């Protein structure tokens, strides 16, 4: 398990960050913690100032899936911080991506074996984060597979997305505006 489309220094720098945060939340340098404990501490540390703590708990709990998994480890934090940039703007990247998913078919899945149940279908559209390369989002579409990477070290204010050609994108919004994966409205100007 390691973030991809990253240089060795980036990979090293990311890992050190996860170690720092895992200790700051659980008081341990490794081991395991009770699921509820992690979700609560992460919620208080990652949520926005105006965002209710209960709201952050439901969003993190939903992403941090397995639900029925009593405990969690640093590998889950690694995986979770790899998906949504730095913790500084983690709730912003979550909102950006989930919004697009919720409006284009609810194709984003966070449960494991999402890659196994994805090929069982065919003329559908699913997307998940590679369990081995957590910062890599895989889009399975009728036409073919697409890969787009999240830059765990870059805040939402920056160009935190990059493709295989090294091209950078301002955000999930701008990215799906370039590579589109309807609903008009009564405008009384």
């Amino acid at each position: 398990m390691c973030i991809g489309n990253s240089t060795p220094n980036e990979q090293e720098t990311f890992r050190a960050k996860v170690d720092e945060i895992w200790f700051r939340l659980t008081q341990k340098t490794d081991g395991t913690v009770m699921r509820d404990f992690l979700i609560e501490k992460a919620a208080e540390y990652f949520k926005q100032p105006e965002q209710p703590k209960q709201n952050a708990i439901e969003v993190i709990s939903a992403i941090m899936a397995p639900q029925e998994e009593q405990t969690k480890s640093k590998a889950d934090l690694y995986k979770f911080l790899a998906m949504f940039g730095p913790y500084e703007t983690i709730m912003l990247k979550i909102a950006s991506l989930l919004l697009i998913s919720n409006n284009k078919g609810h194709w984003l899945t966070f449960d494991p074996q999402a890659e196994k149940n994805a090929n069982n279908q065919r003329d559908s559209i699913s997307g998940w984060f590679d369990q081995n390369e957590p910062n890599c989002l895989i889009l399975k579409t009728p036409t073919g597979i697409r890969k787009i990477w999240n830059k765990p070290l870059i805040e939402a204010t920056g160009q935190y997305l990059m493709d295989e050609n090294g091209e950078k994108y301002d955000s999930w919004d701008k990215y799906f505006e370039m590579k589109p994966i309807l609903t008009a409205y009564p405008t009384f100007a």
Side-chain angles (χ1 to χ4, degrees):
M1 189 196 259
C2 192
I3 62 175
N5 206 187
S6 306
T7 72
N9 316 80
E10 285 173 354
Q11 301 178 94
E12 231 35 71
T13 299
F14 178 62
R15 196 168 296 278
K17 232 307 169 309
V18 175
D19 290 322
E20 172 199 301
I21 302 181
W22 170 262
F23 179 69
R24 184 163 176 63
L25 303 176
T26 69
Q27 245 92 303
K28 302 175 170 173
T29 50
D30 216 306
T32 61
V33 129
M34 285 294 102
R35 183 160 194 293
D36 288 346
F37 184 91
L38 221 221
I39 306 288
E40 181 167 7
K41 285 282 170 292
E44 300 181 306
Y45 201 73
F46 305 150
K47 80 177 199 68
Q48 298 275 99
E50 339 76 38
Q51 179 185 16
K53 176 178 156 184
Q54 245 304 303
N55 172 255
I57 285 171
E58 302 170 335
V59 168
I60 286 173
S61 177
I63 294 173
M64 209 104 102
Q67 305 304 314
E68 21 55 57
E69 178 160 281
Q70 295 173 44
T71 67
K72 250 89 228 305
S73 63
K74 185 204 285 163
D76 305 298
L77 225 222
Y78 186 97
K79 168 161 62 176
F80 178 61
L81 289 178
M83 299 186 258
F84 301 105
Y87 89 92
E88 286 92 344
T89 57
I90 189 159
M91 233 43 106
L92 296 174
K93 295 193 186 199
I94 285 167
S96 168
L97 211 222
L98 262 60
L99 191 277
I100 291 171
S101 164
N102 291 333
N103 289 351
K104 297 282 144 285
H106 306 281
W107 47 260
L108 220 205
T109 174
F110 290 113
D111 95 291
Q113 295 104 197
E115 169 168 348
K116 305 178 186 180
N117 302 304
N119 84 303
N120 289 314
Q121 302 164 51
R122 181 169 173 171
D123 200 67
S124 67
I125 291 179
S126 70
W128 67 91
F129 280 99
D130 191 293
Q131 212 76 297
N132 291 315
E133 248 179 67
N135 71 309
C136 182
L137 168 70
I138 291 165
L139 283 168
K140 209 269 278 80
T141 65
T143 146
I145 302 286
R146 300 234 261 71
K147 281 178 178 180
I148 185 70
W149 292 259
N150 173 65
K151 307 295 277 171
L153 301 167
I154 297 149
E155 289 179 24
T157 32
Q159 293 194 298
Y160 64 92
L161 282 195
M162 188 180 41
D163 63 31
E164 75 272 6
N165 297 126
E167 292 274 353
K168 298 176 292 306
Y169 297 94
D170 292 354
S171 59
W172 291 110
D173 314 284
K174 206 198 80 183
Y175 175 74
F176 284 127
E177 186 187 67
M178 307 266 280
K179 275 70 179 183
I181 322 166
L182 214 79
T183 50
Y185 179 87
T187 293
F188 316 140

